[PDB]
Each structure stands twice: as C-alpha cells, then as structure tokens.
Amino acid sequence: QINVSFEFFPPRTSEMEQTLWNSIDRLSSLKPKFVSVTYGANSGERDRTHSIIKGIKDRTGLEAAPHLTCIDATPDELRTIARDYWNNGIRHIVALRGDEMYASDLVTLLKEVADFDISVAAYPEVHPEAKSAQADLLNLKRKVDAGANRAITQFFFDVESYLRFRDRCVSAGIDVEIIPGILPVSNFKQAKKLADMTNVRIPAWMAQMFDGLDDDAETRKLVGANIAMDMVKILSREGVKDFHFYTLNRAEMSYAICHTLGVRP
Amino acid sequence: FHASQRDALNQSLAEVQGQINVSFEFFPPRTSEMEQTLWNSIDRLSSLKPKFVSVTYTHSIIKGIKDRTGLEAAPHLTCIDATPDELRTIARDYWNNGIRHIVALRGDEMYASDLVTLLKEVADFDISVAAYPEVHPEAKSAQADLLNLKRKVDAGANRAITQFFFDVESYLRFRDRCVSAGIDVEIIPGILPVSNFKQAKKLADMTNVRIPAWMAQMFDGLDDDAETRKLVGANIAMDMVKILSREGVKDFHFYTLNRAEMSYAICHTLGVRP
Amino acid sequence: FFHASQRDALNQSLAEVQGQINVSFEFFPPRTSEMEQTLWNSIDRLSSLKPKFVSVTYGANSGERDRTHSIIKGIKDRTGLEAAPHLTCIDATPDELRTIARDYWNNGIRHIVALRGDLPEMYASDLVTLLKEVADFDISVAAYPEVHPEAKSAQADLLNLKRKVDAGANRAITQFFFDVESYLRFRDRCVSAGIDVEIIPGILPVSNFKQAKKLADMTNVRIPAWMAQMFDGLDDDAETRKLVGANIAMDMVKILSREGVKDFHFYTLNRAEMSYAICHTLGVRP
Amino acid sequence: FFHASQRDALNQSLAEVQGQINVSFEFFPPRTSEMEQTLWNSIDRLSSLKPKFVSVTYGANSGERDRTHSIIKGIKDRTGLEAAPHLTCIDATPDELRTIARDYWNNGIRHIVALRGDLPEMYASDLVTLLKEVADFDISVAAYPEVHPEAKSAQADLLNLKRKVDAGANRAITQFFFDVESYLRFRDRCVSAGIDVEIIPGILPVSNFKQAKKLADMTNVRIPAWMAQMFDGLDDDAETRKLVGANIAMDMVKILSREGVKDFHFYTLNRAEMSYAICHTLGVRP
Ligand SMILES: Cc1cc2nc3c(=O)[nH]c(=O)nc-3n(C[C@H](O)[C@H](O)[C@H](O)COP(=O)(O)OP(=O)(O)OC[C@H]3O[C@@H](n4cnc5c(N)ncnc54)[C@H](O)[C@@H]3O)c2cc1C
Ligand SMILES: Cc1cc2nc3c(=O)[nH]c(=O)nc-3n(C[C@H](O)[C@H](O)[C@H](O)COP(=O)(O)OP(=O)(O)OC[C@H]3O[C@@H](n4cnc5c(N)ncnc54)[C@H](O)[C@@H]3O)c2cc1C
Ligand SMILES: Cc1cc2nc3c(=O)[nH]c(=O)nc-3n(C[C@H](O)[C@H](O)[C@H](O)COP(=O)(O)OP(=O)(O)OC[C@H]3O[C@@H](n4cnc5c(N)ncnc54)[C@H](O)[C@@H]3O)c2cc1C
Ligand SMILES: Cc1cc2nc3c(=O)[nH]c(=O)nc-3n(C[C@H](O)[C@H](O)[C@H](O)COP(=O)(O)OP(=O)(O)OC[C@H]3O[C@@H](n4cnc5c(N)ncnc54)[C@H](O)[C@@H]3O)c2cc1C
Numbered sequence A: 001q002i003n004v005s006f007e008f009f010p011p012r013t014s015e016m017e018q019t020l021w022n023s024i025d026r027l028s029s030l031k032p033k034f035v036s037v038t039y040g041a042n043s044g045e046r047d048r049t050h051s052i053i054k055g056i057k058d059r060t061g062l063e064a065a066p067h068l069t070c071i072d073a074t075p076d077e078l079r080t081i082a083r084d085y086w087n088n089g090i091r092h093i094v095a096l097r098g099d100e101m102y103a104s105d106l107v108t109l110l111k112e113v114a115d116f117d118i119s120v121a122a123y124p125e126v127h128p129e130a131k132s133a134q135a136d137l138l139n140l141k142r143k144v145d146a147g148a149n150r151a152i153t154q155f156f157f158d159v160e161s162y163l164r165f166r167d168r169c170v171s172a173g174i175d176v177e178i179i180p181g182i183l184p185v186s187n188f189k190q191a192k193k194l195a196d197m198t199n200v201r202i203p204a205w206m207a208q209m210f211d212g213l214d215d216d217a218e219t220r221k222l223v224g225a226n227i228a229m230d231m232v233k234i235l236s237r238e239g240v241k242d243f244h245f246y247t248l249n250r251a252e253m254s255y256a257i258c259h260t261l262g263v264r265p
Numbered sequence B: 001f002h003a004s005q006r007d008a009l010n011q012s013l014a015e016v017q018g019q020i021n022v023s024f025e026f027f028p029p030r031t032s033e034m035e036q037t038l039w040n041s042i043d044r045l046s047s048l049k050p051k052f053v054s055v056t057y058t059h060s061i062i063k064g065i066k067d068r069t070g071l072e073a074a075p076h077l078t079c080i081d082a083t084p085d086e087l088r089t090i091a092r093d094y095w096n097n098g099i100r101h102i103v104a105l106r107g108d109e110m111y112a113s114d115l116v117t118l119l120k121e122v123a124d125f126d127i128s129v130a131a132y133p134e135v136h137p138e139a140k141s142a143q144a145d146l147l148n149l150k151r152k153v154d155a156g157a158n159r160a161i162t163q164f165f166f167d168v169e170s171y172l173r174f175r176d177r178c179v180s181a182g183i184d185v186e187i188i189p190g191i192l193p194v195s196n197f198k199q200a201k202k203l204a205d206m207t208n209v210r211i212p213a214w215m216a217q218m219f220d221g222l223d224d225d226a227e228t229r230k231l232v233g234a235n236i237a238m239d240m241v242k243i244l245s246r247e248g249v250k251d252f253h254f255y256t257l258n259r260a261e262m263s264y265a266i267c268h269t270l271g272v273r274p
Numbered sequence C, D: 001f002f003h004a005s006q007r008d009a010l011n012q013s014l015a016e017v018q019g020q021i022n023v024s025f026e027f028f029p030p031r032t033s034e035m036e037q038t039l040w041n042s043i044d045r046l047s048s049l050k051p052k053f054v055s056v057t058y059g060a061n062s063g064e065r066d067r068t069h070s071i072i073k074g075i076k077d078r079t080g081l082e083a084a085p086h087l088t089c090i091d092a093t094p095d096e097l098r099t100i101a102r103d104y105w106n107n108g109i110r111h112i113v114a115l116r117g118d119l120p121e122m123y124a125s126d127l128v129t130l131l132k133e134v135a136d137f138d139i140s141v142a143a144y145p146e147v148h149p150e151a152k153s154a155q156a157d158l159l160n161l162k163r164k165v166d167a168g169a170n171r172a173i174t175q176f177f178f179d180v181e182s183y184l185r186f187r188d189r190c191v192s193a194g195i196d197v198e199i200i201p202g203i204l205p206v207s208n209f210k211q212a213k214k215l216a217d218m219t220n221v222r223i224p225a226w227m228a229q230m231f232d233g234l235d236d237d238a239e240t241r242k243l244v245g246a247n248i249a250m251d252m253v254k255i256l257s258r259e260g261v262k263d264f265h266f267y268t269l270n271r272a273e274m275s276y277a278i279c280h281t282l283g284v285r286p
C-alpha cells in the first residue's frame, strides 16, 4: 500500500551520466508511481532536465516529471514550454519558484494550459525566506488551491518536525498528501551543507553518528542506511504511505530502504 | 510516541560513547585469500581496542594476534577432542606463554563444566563459557540447560557469552531467568551481523536459533543482491544493539566470520571508535 | 516507559534550540525610587541576552504618558536596544496621537505597541491605521487566545486581530495564558482566518500567585486547577512560590518550543530573575 | 497536541497524589558553626513536613562517629522524629559494631542505614546480619540503579542487593540518578530477581552543578547531555542554577510519581529550600 517516487538530477559529466542510467534501471524495477528530474539554471538548464525526462520515458515507460521553475522565465515562455511538454506526453510537472512570479502563479499558469498533475514544494521547517511559519503554511494552501494535487517536503532529519507539520496542514484544510522527501545520507559533509542552506535541523545524535567518518565511505553508508530505514519505519507507522527519495542519482541506499518498506520488484 | 521514543533511544546511544566493551571472534583461515582477509580485519578491528579477541577451535593465530597488536587474545578450547590429561598439557602450555583467558567449551566424556574445573585446577585463568538463550539443542529442558550454565559459572567461569539470536526478547527473558537462578556473571550477547541470509539460516538451524518471521521476510528476495543484504543486515544488527544498550547491556561479542566492515560499523554506532 | 522517554526527548530538543529563539521583554514605568532601582538592574541584566526588542507599558487614562517616554529614552541611551512604547488611543484624540507618533519617529523610536486600552471611539485597528499614515512604523498588537472580555464572540475577536494585521500590524503578541493548548488552538485558528503574522506568546512567570490570579480574573485567563493547587498554601512562602512558578514557566516554554514557537515575549513586571532563567533554558544566554 | 495534553494529565495526576507520598531526608554532620546553624534551620523547616524518618550520614574511615550520634540524639530530642544513623562496617570490628548497635537500640534508635562504606573484610550484607542478631532493627540498605563502581557485573550487584534484603533489610534506597529510565528499568529488574522490598529513589536536588558532577563521576552516575547543557554557563549564577535544578527535580518526581513511586528520599546536603519545594509539588505540605 506504499507508493514511492525517485528524484534525479541532470548529469554534468560522462561518469555521472553512466551512474544515473544504472540507477534508473535499478530503481525502475520497483515500479515507482513517478520519478522526477531537477532543474538548475546554471547547472544544465531546462534542456538538460528535459533530455533526461525524455530519456527516462523512452527507456522505462515511467511517468517522469520535470521540475519547472519560473525564475528568469516570462509567462509566455512558460506557456509555450508547458504546451510542448503536454503534447509530448509529459503530464506531471513539479512546479517551483526556483533557487516576480511565486510558485502559486506557476501552478495557475500551468492549469490554464492543460490538466497537468502538479506537485509543489512544502517546508516542515519553514522556507528560509518566509516572513513567518504561518505565512509559509498559507502559501502552501494557496498553491494547493491553485491546483496542486500533492506536496513534496524538503528533506528533514527531525521526524517530529514532519509529523507536526502534517498536522498543521490538515488543520489548515490542506487535503492533499504531504509526501515526505527522504534524503538517505552517505556523505555527511555534503548533507550538512545542504541542510544548513535550507534551515533543516540536524539532530545532535545524527551529527555524532557521522563524527569521525570523513574518510570512511563504507561505514557512512551503513550508518546512513540505518538512519533512513529507521525514519521510514516510524513514518509508515504514523500512516505515511508515500515517500519521495532524493537519490542524488545513486540507487543502492534508496533501493534498500524501499526493500524494508516492502517495495520490491 | 514512536518518534519521541526513537529520538530518546538514539540520544541515549550517543551518550554511551566510551563505555561499551566489545570483543571479536575469529576463525582459523582455510585459504591464502582468507588468511589475508583475517589479518586485514584484525588490523582494522584492533583500532577499536576490544577488551579481548578470540579464535575458534589456533595457537598460532593467538600468538600472531598477541605479538601483532598486543591485544588480549583468548583461544577457544574444547574437550570433545583430547583426553583430560592432554588438556592439562595444552592448558599449561598457554598459561606459560602469556595466555590468561580461555573460552572453555565442550565442543561441537567430560562436559564444559568439567573443563572449567580442570582449567581452574591448573591456573587462575579468566574463563568464558557458552550460554543459550533459546536452549542448547541437546538439553532436556530450558531449566536443565540453565542449571548447567550455573554449574559452569560455579566451577569458575566469570563470563558467559550467548549463542547468536535474532529475537531480542528471547535474550532479555533469558537474562532475567539467569539472575533469578543466582548466576552472578554477565550474559554477554553474541552478535551475528548477517550479510548472507542463506548461510545464517543454515547456522541457525544447526544451533536451534529461531529466525523470526519478520527477519525471514526482510531477507526474502535478496538471494542475489549482496548490496541490499548488507544494508538490511547492518540495520537489523544496529537496531539490536541499540535496544540491548538501553536495557543496560554494556558488553557485546561479535561473530565477525573474519570480516571487519559490519562489526566495525555496529561498534561505531555504540560509540566504539578509533 | 512513555512518560520518561517523552521527557528526555523534549529536554534534548530544547537543548538543540540554542541560538534560534528570539525574545522580548516588557517593563512598566517605576512608581517609586525602589522600583526605579529594580528596573534598571533588570534592564542591565536582561539586555545582556540581546532581546529583539523591549517594550514599556503605558496605563490608559493615567495621564502619565511622559513617564513612559522617559523610560524609553533611558533604555535606548543606556543599552542601544530597540525600545517600543505602548501607546493607547482610548485616551487621546487622533491629532494628539499623530503628534505623539511624529515625535516618537523623530526621536528614533520606530516600533510601537499599538493598543486601545481599557474604557476609562477609536479601536486599536484605528490606531494602527493612524500610525501607518504617520510613518512606516513596526507595529505590534494584542491577541487573545482566550478571547478579549468585551468581544461579542470569539469569531468577532479573531476577525478584529485580522483587521489590525491588515491595517499594518506586523507582530501579534498574546495576553498571557496558562492553558498551553489554548494558545496552540488559537494559533491554528489564526491560520484558518488567513492571518499571516507570527503569533508571539506572552509569558507571565508567576512569583506572586495572589497577584497573578487577580490579573487572570480581570482578563478572562483560565488558571488550571492543577496550578491553583500548586500555589495553595504558599501565601507566605516567597521562596517556594518562585521555584514552583519557574518550573511552570519552564515547562510551558519547553512545550511551545517543541511545537515550533521561536519567539517569546516576557511580562517581567520589572523583575529579571525568572525571565532570565527561563531564557537560559531556551538557550538564550549572554 | 500530544505534548501539551501529556503535560496537563501529568500535572493533574500529581495534584491528586496529595496525602499519599512518604518522604525522608538525609543530613550530614555539620563541620562548622555556620553549617550547624544551617542544619538546624533545615531540620526545623523539613520536620514540619512529617517525614517518615530522617537519617544522618557517617563518613567511613573518618573516626568522627561521635558527631553522627550527637546529631541523631539532637534531632530526636528536638523533633520527636525517627532518626536513623548511617553505620559503616569497613572501619570497625564486629565486636565494636555490636556494641555500637546495642547502644543505639538502648537509646531508642531502632532504624539503621547499614552500609559498607568505601575502602579506606565485611560487606554490607554481613553488617545487616550482625545488626539483626543484636535486635529487630529496621534496616535500610543502598541500591545502585547504575551499578556500584566496584561490582564485577550488574548481575552480581543485583544479587548483592537481594543478599542484603534476605539478610533482613526492609528498605532499599537508591544512589541518586538523573536518567529516570535507569531507575525504572532497575526497579523492574529487582522484581525479576525476586526482591520484594520497595526500591526508594534517592533524589539529589542540584543547586551546585560543579559539586554534583564531581559526586556523579565518583559514583558512576550518568549526567545526560541535556542536563550538562542546562547548567553550562551558570558557574557564577547561583540564582539561575537553583531555578534550573528545581525544575529538573520537580520534573523527575512528577514522572516517578506517575509510575507509582510513593516514597522519596532526599539528599538535602543540609539545605531545606529545594527539597521543601519539591515536596510541596508532591502534595507533602505542613
Ligand atoms: C521537493 C522539492 C523539489 C525542488 N526542486 C528544485 C529544482 O529542481 N530546481 C530549483 O532551482 N529549486 C528546487 N527546489 C527549491 C525551490 O525552488 C526553492 O526552495 C525556492 O526558493 C522556493 O520555491 P517554491 O516553489 O517553494 O516557492 P514558493 O512556494 O513560491 O515559496 C517561496 C517563498 O516565497 C514565499 N511566498 C509565497 N507567496 C508569497 C507572497 N505572495 N508574498 C511574499 N512571500 C511569498 C514563501 O512563503 C516562501 O518563503 C525544490 C524544493 C523542494 C521542496
Ligand atoms: C560463544 C560460543 C563460542 C564457541 N566456540 C566453539 C569453538 O571454538 N569450537 C567448537 O568446536 N565449538 C564452539 N562452540 C559450540 C559448542 O561447543 C557447542 O555448542 C557444544 O555443543 C556445547 O558446548 P558447551 O561449551 O556449551 O558445552 P556444555 O556447557 O558442557 O553443555 C553442552 C550440553 O550438555 C548438557 N549438559 C552439560 N552438563 C550435563 C550433565 N552433567 N548432565 C546432562 N546434560 C549436561 C548441556 O545442557 C548442553 O546441552 C561455541 C558456542 C558458543 C555459544
Ligand atoms: C501584549 C499586550 C500589551 C498591552 N499593553 C497595554 C498598555 O501598555 N496599556 C494599557 O492600558 N493596556 C494594555 N493592554 C491591554 C489593552 O489595552 C486591553 O486589553 C484593552 O481592553 C484592549 O486593547 P486592544 O489593543 O486589544 O483593543 P482592540 O483590539 O481594539 O480590541 C478591544 C475589544 O474591542 C473589540 N472590538 C475591536 N474592534 C471593534 C469594533 N469595530 N466594534 C465593536 N467591538 C470591537 C475587540 O474584539 C475587543 O473585544 C495590553 C494587552 C496585551 C495583550
Ligand atoms: C542511600 C545511601 C546512603 C549512604 N550513606 C553513606 C554513609 O553515611 N557513609 C559512607 O561512608 N558511605 C555511604 N554510602 C556509600 C557506600 O558506603 C558506598 O557506596 C560503598 O562503596 C558501598 O557501600 P554498600 O553499603 O553499598 O556496600 P555493599 O552492598 O557491600 O556493596 C559494595 C560493593 O561490594 C560488592 N559486593 C557485595 N558483596 C560482595 C562479595 N561477597 N564479594 C565481592 N564483591 C561484593 C557489591 O556488588 C558492590 O560492588 C551511601 C550510599 C547510598 C546509596
């Protein structure tokens, strides 16, 4: 009864390109509900995001959702892009503002073009630029009311933060699924940098768990897998039936975590 | 409640750092490839400063370990092999080289309780004996096997080390029954980190160790997926020691099967680090 | 053992909050030389905690507005902190209010706590609008998790808070409460009403229960039975009252922090010890 | 809102405990005229709480046994309370111990806290047996939820407690702890070992953390990281330390009470304020 999705990013080197396709073959066997591919304005552009989406569709037949932002894009460009995507069978978009228009404006624009499945970003620990937690929650509701049919959370390591946030979403009348984004950690220095930039709290017990492992990739993997397996176990017990994995183009950890959730080939 | 409990459990584990004693069990290699692997694991695991390491039955490995690392290395000694006289000659030999700790077993005439008494009659060894939370296969009953452990301790055993187990409750209930029976030594959990479920299942079926339904299911479908087995097995073992540590267990014995990676990682989670 | 486990998790979560909590302190104008001395001692002590701002009350209908302004200037001069006067509209004409507001702004006072005040005309929302017309003030307004005593309904009072925010208020600060669930339920209702400002809990550390009970009864604030029982028999035991009160307040902020509250406003009544210690538990330290 | 609901229930349950909790207080022999004054002030204050008994320590190897006996007689004469001397066997022969015990009994002292004492022969269980041979004393003995530092194992230490109970001890009093789960787990293990006496938690209210940390480190008692963090930065702030410590102790006894504990032994270190207030929260009042 558990659905999963996997997020990938467009490879920038030949080596990473090989890694990604290996990972897609591995993870496709788990029949994810969808997969998605991120966008970076200065790290590959829309064309690379779209190329990987098309490649995934052709190779696997899976539903593949591009992350589409509105930064430095005009409404007419976004409409033209959306039409093209829809006509080419891309019918799920993760609608974002991007690292003028806010994301709710993009949701509205997209639904005007066609009846897209739309996913939007949610922040259990509050978007860094929000004027308040209340304002950020009202924004998520605006995005949902504009037509988003699921929210996907920023990653978190304090599970209670997700659970409390989900409760506040329900109280606010936000009736779509709030799907936890899960970041399996194999490189803690990299995770800490991402977390610091996004205001995501790293519990002291977790920082302690990675202490002394800067040069021990094997132990980091086993420790990180344990942390992620524990988290998904707790979340599932609390009624979560959908998980979105931030794979960073690697399959092994996400595949194993899915295994423990009973999501298997 | 589930979330808050895990946070508490994880933080409690974080704070035990520097208070857990561990030991590592190795076996004599049977090939050149396994020889290399063994000494690589010994070098990797020695950095953790185990209270002792042990070698199944051997004398050479024990000496090599002692000279190479200066760690207390306890040979396993059985009496299903030699005569009561030969043992005295074999035991007196160890004590005359620096071997002060011996794992006394009956072995896969006399029972282990007889070997403890004999060794004690030879010298003031540290003596570790085997315990069976799920009852030794030959024992007539749980109580008889329990009384036997008591005999072995009363004869001079100062540590008991358990057969591996996967049902934590079985261990905990057994530990309680031991104290109620007046056994005043710790019941040190033997931990078997599982990377090969087929192999672990074979071992368990030979030793009367139960494989829970949940565990069989966790390994279902992974016969050809070494990577996923390793992550799943590490998770299981890490969860086990986390629970055991909260229940006040501060000693763990690892059945490494001569491989360091899993036990090393599990130790790391217990705050046992270089 | 659920209760024990829950405590450890709550305590550890509190510990990891260090550096994330913003605090403010409310003072009142001293009426005696002794209270004047106490206040400045408290200001020195609490200023070391780097509060986001401090504020100074002004009693509606008192005619003692100059005392409030004098204390405000003294705080700014002495500490360099942002100091916000409370300003009430029930006892001044709009023209007088515009004059007072202009003088504040020209004196570098750019955060006002805008209130109606008790009836011995304008409502607080009218003052918010008047102030924003004068200059781009930071404006804080009163919120009532347990409903203002004069409100025709909880809905009317909630829509009034919305009115004040829509008029320009960029902070809401609550009346004190002892029923933590009441605050949390109110915070959720504020979202339901589309109010996008953070709802900052006002905390009253209790060292004198007789006094607190008088204030609570005047303001429609509920004192849970367990709290009444906790202070029973302590009329002549100031030491035990302080320890009991500190325990209550520390418990309250620990729970609020876990529920995501990262701003606290303390009703110090010009005393530093309790608020300082409560701040310490929140990781707000010199 | 689980956390808020859990607090209210725990607080209300504590309130309904009034009249059901038994308490005892431990004192030590004063070493200066100033401490002598403090002790008698504390005895007067705490005696009003009607403790089941009080006790007075005796430092093993100190040679100052007469000071303990003198304080005990003074307490009985002044308050009429049951007062129990601590008696150690490490530093006296069995004959001396029988003499001391007989003199106690003939002096109306019929509860002894029977201890081994630190090594500068007999174990505490030997003293229990010796005392019971002299007369039908009430005998209290030490228990260690976190295991006595010298024990060969947790099992050995637990069986030792059983030995002391089987020898005649009718109370067990624990070393202090700050990890509440450790006490609760130990209480369960005591049942598993067939020990039928109540395991009374010894509570150390902390006002001086440096001192407490020294004691804890000597006795193998764990200080949770959140507690270390709570006292960080308070070396020169006695006021905040007291409020923080009171909060910790009050939280601890609230949890213990909910788990069915109805007996508490306070390590007062001769000071009354904290223990008195903690007792107040348990409904133990004059
Ligand atoms: C699951 C997930 C996938 C992501 N994928 C990508 C990706 O592929 N590429 C990329 O560049 N970034 C990506 N991001 C990050 C995202 O782009 C940033 O977090 C960005 O800063 C906000 O995007 P958003 O869609 O959340 O914007 P919004 O929902 O519009 O919110 C952004 C901020 O604006 C505030 N806000 C909303 N409306 C108003 C208003 N009317 N007035 C004032 N403030 C307002 C919000 O409260 C918030 O603080 C992703 C984030 C998540 C959670
Ligand atoms: C940590 C550990 C390390 C081990 N290392 C080795 C090794 O290096 N080499 C090896 O060959 N094997 C090893 N073994 C396995 C062990 O040798 C076998 O399990 C053997 O079957 C029993 O050995 P034991 O020392 O338990 O014998 P025992 O303690 O003597 O008990 C064995 C059986 O005899 C029964 N029994 C004992 N005394 C009596 C009596 N007086 N009357 C009736 N029944 C009695 C007991 O209940 C039990 O069923 C190890 C086992 C463990 C748990
Ligand atoms: C943090 C804080 C600081 C304070 N500082 C002071 C101070 O320094 N000096 C002082 O004298 N008092 C102070 N007060 C108290 C305050 O002044 C009283 O509570 C007063 O009764 C209402 O003030 P208000 O700003 O909330 O008024 P309002 O927001 O105007 O509300 C007052 C009542 O009017 C009702 N109401 C609002 N608009 C209408 C309308 N159009 N028609 C009919 N009813 C309406 C509201 O529902 C409410 O019942 C403070 C209160 C708080 C919470
Ligand atoms: C409530 C309380 C009050 C106290 N009051 C005092 C005081 O007033 N004066 C003072 O000097 N100290 C006092 N102590 C401390 C005490 O004396 C020390 O902790 C001392 O080290 C042990 O005392 P015990 O009575 O617990 O000894 P025991 O119960 O005899 O135990 C001491 C150690 O010996 C081990 N042991 C017991 N029997 C044997 C055996 N047959 N063979 C090998 N090991 C054995 C036990 O496991 C334990 O490790 C007190 C402790 C508590 C908890």
Ligand SMILES: OC[C@@H](O)[C@@H](O)CO
Residues within 6 Å of the ligand: A038, A153, A154, A155, A181, A183, A194, A246, A248
């Ligand atoms: O939402 C943030 C997510 O895209 C990062 O974890 C990328 O890895």
